[PDB]
């Protein structure tokens, strides 16, 4: 087996836990949770969301 990375939060997705999405352009996204999923459908930016790994690494926290 393997573990993966939420498009939004960038989190380990242990098997089965979480949702998957396949846009018409064949981009396969994965979501650990409906929180991330709903934000994605809202077309939010994780780099702006604070608790996200992208914001974390863009503001240079936990270096």
């Amino acid at each position: 087996m393997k573990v993966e990375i939420d498009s939004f939060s960038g989190a380990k997705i242990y098997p089965g836990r979480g949702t998957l999405f396949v846009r018409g352009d064949s981009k396969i996204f994965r979501f650990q949770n409906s929180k991330s999923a709903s934000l994605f459908k809202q077309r939010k930016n994780p780099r702006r969301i604070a608790w996200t790994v992208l914001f974390r690494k863009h503001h240079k926290k936990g270096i």
């Binding site: 087996m1 989190a11 380990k12 242990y14 098997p15 089965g16 836990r17 650990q32 949770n33 936990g62």
Partner: protein, 386 residues
């Protein structure tokens, strides 16, 4: 006049009456078929339903598409501390059925089981089985002959056992007590086996083994007085309807001028005895051991109890069971396990099972981490972590 468009009986009538059980501990109606060629051993067990979780393994049915591929499966977990054998009774057979002629207990008893004899224990002399111990306190004064009576008679024997509700994390202190049939060897052997095992633990490593199909017998969760619509699966009547739509519209014809039993009706849902079968065991595991949650592939030392515990149960520090799928019964509840009655091979009951990974994540939410080590690793330190 006839039914214009056909459709089947809503619900199942073998499972009637849909009424509250006689107990919080489902009766075991039937045990397997006794045979003598095997050794004396139990044919049932008792534990407490703890909860569910989810695992991973490699299927093997030669002809599927997930043959030799991974899957993920919902399992159910039971906490099965070893049951204390105390006593046995003897059943002689009549044209009026099996019938107990003797119940032999043991000398010494635990507060939990004689509490189960009592109701108001906190104000009690605790006077129970004292004169039984005084029938004991000698060599065999009035016990040896009961045993030999059971030998001379009693085609069937059932061993009395009780649980360790104090080993559980529960808050009851009132042990559960029950009988199990033995389906091995001869009758003298059964009784002397039990005599050896008076006041003695018995465990799941002895009663069961992996890849065994069993029956789960328990009482299904109570849902109160309920309408016909959830209780039977009847069509919700339409929007425009005076005086209720969560109903059955016609409940019978003019003639017979009575309500037929088969018609649906509101009333008790749940707290029902149920006996589900063909539940493959996937893992026995040990309280007196760590790494219960760790397969040969993971090898990350971790028990089965997730972060923050089982919801409404706690920990699994006793011997435990992981079985495929669901079972009748809710969390914190008793459960009566049972060997099968029939040598189902089917290339489904013989599918040998070896595991890969076991979700030990928090069910009190949407848990991302199986371990706080992993948690701190992913997160870094924290304000509280000085």
């Amino acid at each position: 006049s006839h039914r214009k468009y056909e459709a089947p009986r809503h619900g199942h009538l073998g499972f009637l009456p849909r009424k509250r059980a006689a107990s919080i501990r489902a009766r075991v109606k039937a045990f397997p078929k006794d045979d003598r060629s095997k050794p004396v051993a139990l044919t049932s067990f008792l534990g407490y339903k703890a909860g569910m979780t989810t695992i991973v393994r490699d299927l093997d049915r030669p002809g599927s598409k997930f043959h030799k591929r991974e899957v993920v499966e919902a399992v159910t977990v039971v906490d099965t501390p070893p049951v204390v054998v105390v006593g046995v009774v003897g059943y002689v057979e009549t044209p009026r059925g099996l019938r107990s002629l003797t119940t032999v207990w043991a000398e010494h008893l635990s507060d939990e089981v004689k509490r189960r004899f009592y109701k108001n224990w906190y104000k009690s002399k605790k006077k129970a089985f004292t004169k039984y111990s005084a029938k004991y306190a000698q060599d065999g004064a009035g016990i040896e002959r009961e045993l030999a009576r059971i030998k001379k008679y009693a085609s069937v024997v059932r061993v009395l056992v009780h649980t360790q509700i104090r080993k559980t994390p529960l808050a009851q202190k009132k042990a559960h007590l029950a009988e199990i049939q033995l389906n091995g060897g001869s009758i003298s052997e059964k009784v002397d086996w039990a005599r050896e095992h008076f006041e003695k633990t018995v465990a799941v490593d002895s009663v069961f083994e992996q890849n065994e199909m069993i029956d789960a017998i328990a009482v299904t969760k109570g849902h109160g007085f309920e309408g016909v619509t959830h209780r039977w699966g009847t069509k919700k009547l339409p929007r425009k309807t005076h005086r209720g739509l969560r109903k059955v519209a016609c409940i019978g014809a003019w003639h017979p001028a009575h309500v037929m039993w088969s018609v649906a009706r509101a009333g008790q849902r749940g707290y029902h005895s149920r006996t589900s079968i063909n539940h493959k065991i996937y893992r026995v595991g040990k309280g007196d051991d760590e790494a219960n949650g760790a397969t040969s592939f993971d090898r990350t030392k971790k028990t089965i109890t997730p972060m923050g515990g089982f919801v409404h149960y706690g920990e699994i520090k006793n011997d435990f069971i992981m079985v495929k799928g669901c079972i009748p019964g809710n969390r914190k509840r008793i459960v009566t396990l049972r060997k099968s009655l029939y040598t189902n091979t089917s290339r489904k009951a013989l599918e040998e099972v070896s595991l890969k990974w076991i979700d030990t994540a928090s069910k009190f939410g949407k848990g991302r981490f199986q371990t706080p080590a992993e948690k701190h690793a992913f997160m870094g330190t924290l304000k509280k972590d000085l």
